[PDB]
Design a protein around this ligand. Structure first.
Ligand SMILES: *[C@H]1O[C@H](CO)[C@@H](O[C@@H]2O[C@H](CO)[C@@H](O)[C@H](O)[C@H]2NC(C)=O)[C@H](O)[C@H]1NC(C)=O
Ligand SMILES: *[C@@H]1O[C@H](CO)[C@@H](O)[C@H](O)[C@H]1NC(C)=O
Ligand SMILES: *[C@H]1O[C@H](CO)[C@@H](O)[C@H](O)[C@H]1NC(C)=O
Ligand code: NA
Lengths: 259, 427, 47
């Protein structure tokens, strides 16, 4: 996360860290939607251009974390995966359209002060909150900058980062990139004339774009960090997978594999 | 700084799972009866040039020697040896050995297997090939610094036979030197002369040697290559290097981006990367997936494995993180060679009739190699950076854990160097 | 009531947790607000 700040403890209890099992390394973000299902970006698991094509056995998820690298004994929960499910219409060749995937935990996880699921939006909530100007929140342990600092690096945070960003009008998103945008993705970020900044960066993919409902005061995951063109650049915006538009797929996968 | 970078002990963590106790293991029954013979035939020779076939076998010997040598140091020690130097020294020394003493050497060094490979191959071919190889590696400059000394030193009271003196010189561009180990002035003049000949690279060649030594092998090598794709210096930053499942240490980490060959080996559970040096030589970096997987990697390394890795690699743009380091070792290979089966040679009763008419006892085979690895290299390799960027972690080959490295001369398939970096902060 | 959450999945395949989703133990449950959620509420200030 670029231009964000340290999250507070338990601020994003549905935050999941996707980990390579062996060798051990942070791969992406993800989110907890129940005691056995995790949601993430499809390209975090399958992306040929980078020779990525993981299976259930190559991964691990770390739930309930705050610190990026410390093993948080009796607070975080480490789980293996039973199965991975990528959207059948996921398009990694052109625009990462339908960049979404589900991962089923090998064993249900217990909830606690640090582990709790986020809600998935219903049609009305999505229709009311997904509008230009409304702000959402993005969290992650990805890099703090796009550019390299001589003899230091791009910068990694010690704890979970968070940043609030406004949803942007389709026309402006469309005019900001030569990439072909679809109805299954939306973009967020500040306009150059707005002064404030912030964005997701390398390593934040898969993490959730959430909004707190003013109708029932519950947190909803409206999007999944997907892609961009450089982090925090003026006139550019981050793109997120439109979760509600793919809710039917999520429901299908869970219905025939959940039990 | 105020943060811990913890390795996760998965077995320990998951052993606390509730269903751990419900595991159903296998009983070791009365009897079974089964097996599968061996025979590590060398069908690796097909299409291989004459010099490559000899180097494939020299490599086979090198890995066996490494296997023995590593069990004589700590698992946390770095290791560095120059296999080609060891093999040529034994080839050279065998010029004056006879009988079984000679046979053990040719057998264990795998020279016997080479002569057997083809009908047109004879012991003379070995010496001829070493003569050619030696010239190419040390008597020519291809773009890297490779300084070396590989001679015999025989106490003056034991005159060296003429035929040996001249053969060593002709086939190995080396010398069987007269020496006086009990004379400090000899040590000084000699160390000094070697320094001048090696332009200051190889120093203290004959230091700390028993004054009663009758004969010893001196093999010192200095190496420093230049990267084809150099590591830009602004990318060099401190990075955590994982020593083991519990400790980490900050080291200078070099970083770059370019098209490099690499592969993921599922059989030996490791990642392999190839880095090109100017002059037709390359460094092969092998990092096991699990830190506890180093012992099995070392245990199964063979020429066949290396060829399998080489064919399986693919070229792709990737970021590379390699710690800079400098290894300087000084071993006495006698004990190791004995364990491999070469014993008569190191016993006074061994037959070295070809070297001297007197009985000589060899107790020291000094093998001292030095290698420096830093960001120096020719240059560039475009500093691209564009648009479309999926936001997951990118493809990088990160050498931040104990690794092995093999340095090969491409044209001859010669294993120049082999090492293990368990800790880049030490030498 | 419209302020009450309505479940959409079947706990038999979804697992437990939907009914109480989106309510943080260390925040909503304790009647505490995080340091920047207010900024989100203020942006929803209509459309
Ligand atoms: C890696 O992903 C799959 C493996 O998950 C690779 O191949 C397919 O694997 C599945 C089993 O998981 C089989 O059902 C298919 O038949 C396999 N395809 C075949 C026969 O080639 C796949 O090749 C790799 N990457 C891609 C492109 O998905
Ligand atoms: C060794 O090789 C030669 C041919 O080069 C052959 O005559 C001899 O039988 C071989 N010995 C064996 C069986 O290894
Ligand atoms: C791919 O291209 C690079 C750039 O020249 C080269 O160094 C590398 O060896 C190539 N890989 C293959 C297939 O040899
Ligand atoms: Na922006």
């Amino acid at each position: 996360i670029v231009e964000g700040s340290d999250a507070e403890i338990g601020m994003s209890p549905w935050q999941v860290m996707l980990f390579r099992k062996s060798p051990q390394e942070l791969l992406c973000g993800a989110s907890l939607i129940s005691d056995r299902w995790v949601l993430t970006a499809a390209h975090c698991l399958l992306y040929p251009p980078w020779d990525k094509n993981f299976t259930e056995n190559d991964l691990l998820v770390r739930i309930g974390k705050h610190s990026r690298t410390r093993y948080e004994r009796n607070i975080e929960k480490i789980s293996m995966l039973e199965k991975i499910y990528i959207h059948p219409r996921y398009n990694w060749r052109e625009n990462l359209d339908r960049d979404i995937a589900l991962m089923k935990l090998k064993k249900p996880v217990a909830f606690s002060d640090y582990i709790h699921p986020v809600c998935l939006p219903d049609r009305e909530t999505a229709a009311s909150l997904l509008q230009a100007g409304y702000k959402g929140r993005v969290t992650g342990w990805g890099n703090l900058k796009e550019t390299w600092t001589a003899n230091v690096g791009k910068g990694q945070p010690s704890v979970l980062q968070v940043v609030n960003l406004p949803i942007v009008e389709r026309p402006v998103c469309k005019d900001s990139t030569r990439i072909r945008i679809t109805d299954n993705m939306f973009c967020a970020g500040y306009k150059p004339d707005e002064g404030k900044r912030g964005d997701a960066c390398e390593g934040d993919a898969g993490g959730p774009f959430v909004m707190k409902s003013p109708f029932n005061n519950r947190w909803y995951q409206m999007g999944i960090v997907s892609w961009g063109e450089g982090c925090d650049r003026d006139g550019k915006y981050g793109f997120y997978t439109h979760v509600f538009r793919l809710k039917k797929w999520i429901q299908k996968v869970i219905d025939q594999f959940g039990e | 700084g105020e943060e811990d970078d913890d390795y996760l002990d998965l077995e320990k963590i998951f052993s606390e799972d509730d269903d751990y106790i419900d595991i159903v293991d296998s009983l070791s029954v009365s009897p079974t009866d089964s097996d599968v013979s061996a025979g590590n035939i060398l069908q690796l020779f097909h299409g291989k040039s004459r010099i490559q076939r000899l180097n494939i076998l020299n490599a086979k010997f090198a890995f066996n020697l490494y296997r023995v040598l590593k069990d004589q140091v700590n698992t946390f020690d770095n290791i560095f040896i120059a296999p080609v130097g060891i093999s040529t020294a034994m080839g050279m020394i065998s010029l004056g050995l006879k009988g079984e003493t000679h046979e053990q050497v040719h057998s264990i060094l795998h020279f016997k297997d080479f002569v057997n490979a083809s009908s047109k191959y004879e012991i003379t071919t070995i010496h001829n090939l070493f003569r050619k190889l030696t010239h190419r590696l040390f008597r020519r400059n291809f773009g890297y610094t490779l300084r070396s000394v590989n001679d015999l030193y025989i106490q003056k009271q034991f005159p060296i036979l003429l035929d040996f003196k001249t053969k060593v010189r002709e086939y190995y561009f080396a010398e069987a030197q007269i020496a006086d180990f009990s004379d400090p002035a000899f040590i000084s003049k000699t160390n000094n002369h070697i320094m001048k000949l090696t332009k200051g690279l190889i120093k203290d060649a004959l230091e700390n040697i028993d004054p009663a030594t009758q004969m010893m092998i001196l093999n010192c090598i200095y190496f420093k290559g230049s990267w084809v794709n150099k590591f830009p210096v602004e990318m060099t930053h401190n990075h955590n290097f994982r020593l083991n499942e519990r400790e980490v240490v900050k080291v200078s980490m070099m970083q770059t981006k370019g098209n490099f060959l690499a592969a993921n080996d599922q059989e030996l559970d490791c990642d392999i990367l190839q880095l090109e040096y100017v002059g037709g030589i390359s460094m092969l970096i092998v990092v096991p997936h699990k830190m506890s997987g180093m012992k099995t990697l070392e245990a199964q390394l063979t020429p066949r494995v290396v060829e399998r890795w080489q064919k399986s690699m693919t070229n792709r743009t990737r970021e590379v993180l390699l710690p800079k380091f400098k290894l300087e070792k000084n071993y006495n290979l006698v004990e190791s060679l004995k364990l491999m089966g070469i014993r008569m040679l190191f016993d006074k009763n061994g037959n070295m009739a070809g070297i001297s008419d007197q009985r000589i006892a060899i107790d020291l085979f000094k093998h001292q190699g030095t290698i420096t690895v830093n960001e120096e290299g020719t240059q560039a390799t475009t500093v691209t950076t564009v648009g479309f960027m999926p936001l997951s972690t990118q493809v990088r080959f990160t050498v931040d854990r104990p690794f092995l490295f093999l340095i090969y001369e491409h044209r001859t398939s010669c294993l120049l160097f082999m090492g293990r970096v368990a800790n880049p902060s030490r030498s | 009531a419209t302020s009450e959450y309505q479940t959409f999945f079947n706990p038999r395949t979804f697992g437990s947790g939907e009914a109480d989703c989106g309510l943080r133990p260390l925040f909503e449950k304790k009647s505490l607000e995080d340091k920047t959620e207010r900024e989100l509420l203020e942006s929803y200030i209509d459309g």
